[PDB]
Amino acid sequence: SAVNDPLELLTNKGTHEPSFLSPIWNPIACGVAGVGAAIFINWGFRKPVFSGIQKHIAFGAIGVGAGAYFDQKRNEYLAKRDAVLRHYIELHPDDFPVKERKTYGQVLESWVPVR
């Protein structure tokens, strides 16, 4: 629409579809991190890197669990953040007034003649 209402801009509509890697990147990233961290420990102790896979599974499992938990909390923090902005906009409609959208017909800015 021709209007610039800041509250409209913030408000979601559900049109956006989050990417495929979005709901899995933090779990999978931590899971790989846990395993890789376990790989150092054996290497640091000059043990066969895949010896004692128990520790790999634990670190991988612990990584996934922690990743999912913190990812769950992340969205609440983001959801709350926009909620704050939307509420603050509503309280001060004067400081965020609706502005009209100019088009290039009604403006004359400079250009840079390279020559």
Partner 1 sequence: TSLTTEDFANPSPKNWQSYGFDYKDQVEDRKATKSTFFVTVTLCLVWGSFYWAYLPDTQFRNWAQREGFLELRRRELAGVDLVSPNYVDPASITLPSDEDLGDTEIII
Partner 2 sequence: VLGLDKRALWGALPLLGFAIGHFLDKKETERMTMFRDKSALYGRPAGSEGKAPSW
Partner 3 sequence: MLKIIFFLLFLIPFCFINNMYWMVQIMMFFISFIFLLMNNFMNYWSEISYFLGCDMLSYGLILLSLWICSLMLLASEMINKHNNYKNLFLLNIIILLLLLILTFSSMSLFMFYLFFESSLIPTLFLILGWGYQPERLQAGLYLLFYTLLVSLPMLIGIFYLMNKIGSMNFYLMNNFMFNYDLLYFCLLCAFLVKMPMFLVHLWLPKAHVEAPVSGSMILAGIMLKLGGYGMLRVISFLQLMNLKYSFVWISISLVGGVLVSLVCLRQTDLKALIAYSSVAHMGIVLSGLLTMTYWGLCGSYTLMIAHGLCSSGLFCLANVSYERLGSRSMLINKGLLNFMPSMTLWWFLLSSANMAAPPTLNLLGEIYLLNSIVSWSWISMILLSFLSFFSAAYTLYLYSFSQHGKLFSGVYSFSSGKIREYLLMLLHWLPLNLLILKSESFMLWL
Ligand X SMILES: CCCCCCCCCCCCCCCCCC(=O)OC[C@H](COP(=O)(O)OCCN)OC(=O)CCCCCCCCCCCCCCCCC
CA neighbor of 61 nearest in space, from 35, 40, 23, 43? 35
* Per rule CB under 6 A, count of chain residues that contact ligand X: 11
Instruction: Give whichever of 18 and 113 is closer to partner 2, judged by the CB atom.
Output: 18
Question: Is residue 10 a contact residue for partner 3 (CB under 8 A)?
Answer: no
From residue 33, alpha-carbon distances to 64, 83, 114 in Å are 9, 33, 52
Using CB under 6 A, pick the residue from 11, 22, 51, 72 that binds ligand X. 22
Q: 3-state SS of 70-84?
A: HHHHHHHHHHHHHHH
Using CB under 8 A, pick the residue from 1, 19, 105, 114 that binds partner 1. 105
Beta bridge partners of 3: 100
Question: Is residue 1 a contact residue for partner 2 (CB under 8 A)?
Answer: no
Question: Which residues of the chain form contacts with partner 3 (CB under 8 A)?
Answer: 19, 21, 110, 112, 114
Question: Which residues of the chain form contacts with partner 2 (CB under 8 A)?
Answer: 15, 17, 19-21
